[PDB]
Design a protein around this ligand. Structure first.
Ligand SMILES: *[C@H](C)[C@H]1/C(=C/c2[nH]c(/C=C3N=C(/C=C4\NC(=O)C(C=C)=C4C)C(C)=C\3CCC(=O)O)c(CCC(=O)O)c2C)NC(=O)[C@@H]1C
Ligand SMILES: *[C@H](C)[C@H]1/C(=C/c2[nH]c(/C=C3N=C(/C=C4\NC(=O)C(C=C)=C4C)C(C)=C\3CCC(=O)O)c(CCC(=O)O)c2C)NC(=O)[C@@H]1C
Lengths: 862, 862
């Protein structure tokens, strides 16, 4: 096996010395070949104190007999002959305690080494939780500057033990490996087992004259070098790295629960032999642990969202109970589409179909019913990843517009559909497509010699239907049957995997106008142990949910008062009110749930009682809303100011609109009419900025552009108009030099947003240009040198000024370098991002003592 | 006694009839004289089914069998003779059941009764917590409009059982009772015991001639009337109410926990006889229960505020440990004055005195030091509310500047003092001072006839010294004495020499060196951890003292180990204290959840030499208070930065519009061109003024400063018209100014932008709700002859006009503040309401037949 070969390896990488001391007599029994030429007699049986100085021996011996030596590493020792600084790393092996010596090429202890990554941890913790891509990208970015390798990657393991690169930052000029998939056999289980114990592997150069550990034959024990930091990599990996042209590597390890699972590895490559000091490697261990800490939060947050999707679906399902059976679930605002994520829905009732979105034709839906009625008659529901895989003869007749389906037969020949469109199943492989039946074998020596990308075309399929999604469809099926259980799941392989669902209806209990209980759901009975008959007429507040001598017991008197308040506030507002409910069951179980209480309305429209139900949220979920509940009104109390300001700023903006519009009627000067056109564009800048409520609403998401005709002559004129008043006041000379043929180009990009981006960028030069200084604006389409045959475009704007350049603090705050942003540099961060959405990036460069804003943009048009 | 007299009372108020039925045979065992004339034959042995209609009798019979009959009260019944409505109040007594009937003079059950207080409940929960005065003030307001009594009071019970009025709202033209104290003799302990059972007690007529309840059953059981709502008030209290001139009363008992203590009472008075229907009385019971819960919450917040002060004192004390010298404890702003709430503090150290704040003279302080040197040798501390009470021979010389003092014996001659100034101890009694030697006497027949306020002057003392404040300064004993068994003498209230043992508040402290080994382990830490300092010194704090496995103190998991390392390294970089959570397992198994404060330790040479970690032990409720504070702060800094970007990026296009207007001027413009330009001018200043005064923190709750600028009336109408002309011209409504040519040409001086801003949104609110037809007319008037123009003032009247039904009042009343719903149309009017109101004017809607009109009158000068 591979593990047996790795643990029996007797070769070490020629960048250090490995001396092993006996556990009992505390003298060397094994040594590396290069020890004599690097530590200076090196013969076996000489105490280490002979080969070092007095402070080194005392420091080593004190930690030699320590309990756990992991934290004391690294240890700075000096040789007796020349006192050349060495780093000593000590790990204990049952055969002999092994010390690895690493020269200190021109931080002692675990805590001091962790300080090297302190700047990286403060960047990971100060991150918006929720997005795993941002967490992965910021971790690879930190390692890139922390270790200084040519290419840093985040290799994430999937369920099939194969991996995919989720993020990558490299030096410019290197081919990107982002998105590539690699076989599971590339990293065997021997390496996966050791990565949970070593957690850091470093290779200085894949072509090195390996040294030999010449342990004496008199040693009864089988000394192991698996845990050492100097272990020579296997010959297959040396050729594997040579094929990828990665001479040096530093592979990290991420373990979710330090149950425990190797989430992935952080791979740092280098085309040249690279050496990294041990404190940095130890620091990377801490950073990986912090990364694994935050990874476990993202999976928890994902688990919270899937719980909120169930809760939101439960809220929707209760609403569909009150609505009319055949047509109520369609006419209202929350449709059947909101129940299950879909691109369309249909409802075949009374030989009539109620299309609700991107659904097949009316004729085609009838043929869907014919296929369902015979091929899958036994099952009342069906879910298919792809309709062609199911066996539909005319799957291709309706095209690739829709390929998934989740249909349940409520009654007779009436069925309700749920259509899902296809997804881009394009996956790129690293040179070998992983397959389930491949297994690691020790006979293989040379790996694949080609690493070119493989484009594996996956058959046309939609997203797989989630397990919780299927119960939501089944829950509506129960609702519709009453208002008037085997499910087929053709997913993946062509196998009719029959399943039964779990009803997702919430525990529902109702009250009449006076207070007597009226309804008691079976889900309510199973949660509390009280049958429907025993709580069918007793008062809810007093006898059913009461403090003393009650069928269900509340915690204290506050619960009694709180329950009565909610049951009375329901009549005032029909909208559901969410409150925390807790009570004891007949068996003494303490349950914590979230109570939704809403009015019950009859056909006449009068209050006929209260319809309420509980949401069985988890303890972690309950605290999430409860904490947010303390600041829930902040979205209303504070929104008054934003709504008032936006409303109060809109009134005189309209006054500006009416005033200048009427000017066009009157007689105007020949060149004077041009002010109206410039003023109109600036006016539209106010209109669009008012629509954008917050910058925080665009940084995490994407601020959509505008597809409109647009000429470059006006925007530069409009952008200059904003900054002339500042420039004319504090003297600043401004000139524009742009292509005359570009005025008639009439580009298809956004005009108001690009004007805004250039407005503050041009303001930047004015605020830092000395009196009388210049300010040049340029433009260059360069349509003949970017491949305009394939529909694309290019753009560039230059902003040069005098004044020895702008200060560093304002300049550094762009590109998300410094976390804190000033009241002045935040706009530049938004402005820089606003051209990132335009496939461009702004840069700075100082030439001849001048400045330059190299802002680039691309016009994605067709 | 008083309780014995009440328990054997056979009189009831002539406001209803009382019928007592036996438990088994259900026959009338007792009745009142008024029953025959109110329920019609009637007598003992009469079945109650023969007094009402069949549907009503069965409803009563159903309630008689209910286990908890307080739920079904009240019950609406009708007499069979004439179907006269009645309310049945039922309560169970061991001897027999008692039924109270109440006439109905033009909600059945407890739930529907609570609906009458639903409006009052929502203005108690939606209250910003922190002060009991606001909660007490609003609760009195709820009962005032609900019950409609002449006056409503909040009577708080103090420790000595005497009461104090803490809140009061009355009908206009009364004598306020706020702040008045009343002796505990007024409310006997017998009445307090009954209030824990009968929450609400009502007296209708003070001079009513009670009708005796006849009971000639010759049975063993004695019929008690304590629980009946019809019970006759005691003879003494009947004369007690006559002196107060309060015929009717409605007292509500407030019990904090239902440990169970009567917090106080809510008293309602009415000069005329008053009747409150039972549902409102039951609703008042629910309101008291909600008030009781909120009172406990206010107490809990007050208790947490004390804990925060202890944590603040603990954090301050840790700084004094690192502070250099007894000279230094004065220099830095975290001085002794912040340690204890005091008006002054003086430190005596080696024949030199340092004073901070309001302290006595140099010479008097020396005698103060000499006074303890000859009076209180045994005690090392002192605490006197008043120095005159303590025994200073020259106490009067110090004056009112300093009256109280806390003293500390740092050394034989070293002393450090604190001073508190005299506080105005004004308490007004109701007419009889309450003395502790007063006991309830059952033989008393007439109460006091004088209720005028009697003012008792309390002796000149200071604020009462708290237990933790004397503890805080004792914690300074150990810190100062160590860096250089005991008794503390307290003089409080009556002259006494109480000796108490203080328990020092020094928090647990542990520190490490630059490598990781522990350097300190406080005795407080040893008690909490169970580990002696000997077993922790010279051992790694991370991994050997605090660690997951094989460690002295066991962390919960790898989460704590990583987090502890982060805070121990961020402290070196960040000198400021870091507030993080910390949990660890004591060797005894205790899971100590606490907060960790880490600050780097600086040597005298200025080089870092480790960390200084101390713990703030906080309850499970205090920790979440800071946790939600950060999350409340989590969206706080974001909106400031988000608004500062929207505000900054709207200013730039405004400068562009300003520049275009400044350049549209040209060489010269036509007669109308500059006029239409002028309308654009004042419209732009409205854009700038709104941005400068954004977020409306002042115009909504304060007196925003206005601008007095030479103004002309004619421009304000035209500029404000164009803002609303866009929507008006486009739709069916029209705008036509009323003839004011003489007065518009006439000049009045005011704030153009502020008046136009108010006028602009008032017209837009009009055009919006004009029902797609009719004309809008705006008029004006200048008043300088009708009002005195010799006062250098003038009156301006602006009158709008509608053509339609009229804006709804439930939205119009929102601008006056009566209504608060989610509709921005009323929000804008309310904010502008104070803006004109700031101009010594008012705004008034004036309804009419065809032409609904506004009225915007403001005070304008010249
Ligand atoms: C030999 C025929 C087979 C083999 C054996 C093998 N592989 C490892 C360890 C690693 N393999 C890795 C693969 C990658 N390297 C990359 O750069 C990328 C993607 C960009 C991948 C997927 C990685 C990483 C490791 C860990 C490196 C390390 O330091 O251990 C080993 C263990 C080496 C050792 O002696 O310790 C072995 C025996 N790998 C093959 O690809 C073929 C099938
Ligand atoms: C009789 C010699 C003594 C006495 C007896 C007494 N008092 C009560 C009940 C109350 N007395 C109250 C006093 C106040 N009333 C007020 O309006 C104010 C302040 C504004 C005060 C301090 C109050 C209140 C009550 C409770 C009234 C209720 O709800 O019942 C009683 C019990 C009456 C009964 O028959 O139940 C008795 C026996 N009070 C005196 O002042 C004299 C000394």
């Amino acid at each position: 096996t591979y593990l047996h070969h790795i643990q029996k390896g007797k070769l070490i990488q020629p960048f250090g010395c490995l001396l092993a001391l006996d556990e009992k007599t505390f003298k060397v029994i094994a040594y590396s070949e290069n020890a004599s030429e690097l530590l200076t007699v090196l013969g076996i049986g000489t105490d280490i104190r002979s080969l070092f100085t007095a402070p080194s021996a005392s420091a080593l011996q004190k930690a030699l007999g320590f309990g756990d030596v992991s934290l004391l590493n690294p240890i700075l020792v000096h040789c007796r002959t020349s006192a050349k600084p060495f780093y000593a790393i000590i790990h204990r092996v049952t055969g002999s305690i092994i010390i690895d010596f690493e020269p200190v090429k021109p931080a002692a202890g675990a805590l001091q080494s962790y300080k090297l990554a302190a700047k990286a941890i403060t960047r990971l913790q100060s991150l918006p939780s929720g997005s795993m891509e941002r967490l992965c990208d910021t971790m690879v970015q930190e390692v890139f500057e922390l270790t200084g390798y040519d290419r840093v990657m985040a290799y994430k393991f999937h369920e099939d033990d194969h991996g995919e690169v989720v993020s990558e930052v490299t030096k410019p000029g290197l081919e990107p490996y982002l998105g590539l998939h690699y076989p599971a056999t590339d990293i065997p289980q021997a390496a996966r087992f050791l990565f949970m114990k070593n957690k850091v592997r470093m290779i200085v150069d894949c072509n090195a004259k390996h040294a030999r550990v010449l342990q004496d034959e008199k040693l009864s024990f089988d000394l192991t070098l698996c845990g050492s930091t100097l272990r020579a990599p296997h010959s297959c990996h040396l050729q594997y790295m040579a094929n990828m042209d990665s001479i040096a590597s530093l592979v990290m390890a991420v373990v979710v629960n330090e149950r425990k699972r190797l989430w992935g590895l952080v791979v740092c490559h280098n085309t040249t032999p690279r050496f990294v000091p041990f404190p940095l490697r130890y620091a990377c261990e801490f950073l990986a642990q912090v990364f694994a800490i935050h990874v476990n939060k993202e999976v928890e947050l994902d688990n919270q969202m899937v719980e909120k999707n169930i809760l939101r679906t439960q809220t929707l399902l209760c609403d569909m109970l009150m609505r009319d059976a055949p047509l109520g679930i369609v006419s209202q605002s929350p449709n059947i589409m909101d129940l299950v994520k879909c691109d369309g829905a249909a409802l075949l009732y009374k030989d009539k179909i109620w299309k609700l979105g991107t659904t097949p034709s009316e004729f085609h839906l009838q043929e869907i019913a014919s296929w369902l009625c015979e091929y899958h008659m036994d099952s009342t529901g069906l879910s298919t990843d792809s309709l062609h895989d199911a066996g539909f003869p005319r799957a291709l007749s309706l095209g690739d517009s829709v390929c998934g389906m989740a249909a349940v037969r409520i009654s007779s020949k009436d069925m309700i559909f749920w259509f899902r469109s296809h997804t881009a199943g394009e996956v790129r492989w690293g040179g070998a497509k992983h397959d389930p039946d491949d297994r690691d074998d020790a006979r293989r020596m040379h790996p694949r010699s080609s690493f070119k990308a493989f484009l594996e075309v996956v058959k046309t399929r939609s997203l797989p239907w989630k397990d919780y999604e299927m119960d939501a469809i089944h829950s509506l099926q129960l609702i519709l049957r009453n208002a008037f259980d085997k499910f087929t799941r053709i997913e993946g392989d062509y196998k009719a995997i029959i399943q039964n669902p779990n009803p997702l209806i919430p525990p529902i209990f109702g009250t009449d106008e006076f207070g007597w209980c009226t309804e008691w759901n079976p889900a309510m009975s199973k949660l509390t142990g009280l049958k429907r008959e025993e709580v069918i007429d007793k008062m809810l507040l007093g006898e059913v949910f009461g403090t003393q001598k009650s069928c269900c017991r509340l915690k204290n008197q506050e619960a009694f008062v709180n329950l009565g308040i909610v049951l009375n506030n329901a009549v005032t507002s029909q909208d559901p009110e969410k409150v925390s409910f807790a009570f004891f069951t007949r068996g003494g179980k303490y349950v914590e749930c979230l109570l939704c209480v809403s009015k019950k309305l009859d056909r006449e429209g009068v209050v006929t009682g209260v319809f309420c139900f509980l949401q069985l949220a988890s303890h972690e979920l309950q605290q999430a809303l409860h904490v947010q509940r303390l600041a829930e009104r902040t979205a209303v109390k504070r929104l008054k100011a934003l709504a008032y300001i936006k409303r109060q700023i809109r009134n005189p903006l309209s006054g500006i609109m009416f005033t200048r519009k009427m000017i066009e009627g009157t007689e105007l000067g020949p060149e004077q009419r041009r002010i109206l056109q410039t003023s109109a564009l600036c006016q539209k800048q106010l209109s669009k900025i008012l629509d954008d409520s917050d910058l925080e609403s665009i940084i995490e998401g994407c601020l959509d552009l505008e597809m409109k005709e647009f000429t470059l002559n006006e925007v530069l004129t409009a952008s200059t108009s904003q900054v002339m008043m500042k420039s004319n006041g504090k003297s600043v000379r401004i000139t524009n030099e742009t292509g005359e043929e570009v005025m008639s180009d009439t580009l298809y990009g956004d005009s108001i947003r690009l004007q805004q981006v250039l407005a503050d960028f041009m303001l930047m030069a004015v605020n830092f240009t000395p009196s009388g200084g210049q300010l040049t604006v340029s433009a260059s389409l360069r349509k003949d040198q970017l491949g305009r045959s394939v529909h694309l475009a290019n753009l560039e704007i230059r902003l040069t000024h005098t004044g020895a350049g702008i200060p560093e603090f304002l300049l550094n705050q762009m590109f998300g370098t410094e976390e804190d942003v000033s009241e002045e540099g935040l706009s530049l961060m938004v402005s820089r991002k606003l051209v990132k959405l335009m496939n461009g990036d702004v840069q700075y460069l100082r030439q001849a003592g001048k400045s330059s804003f190299i802002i680039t943009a691309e016009l994605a048009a067709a």
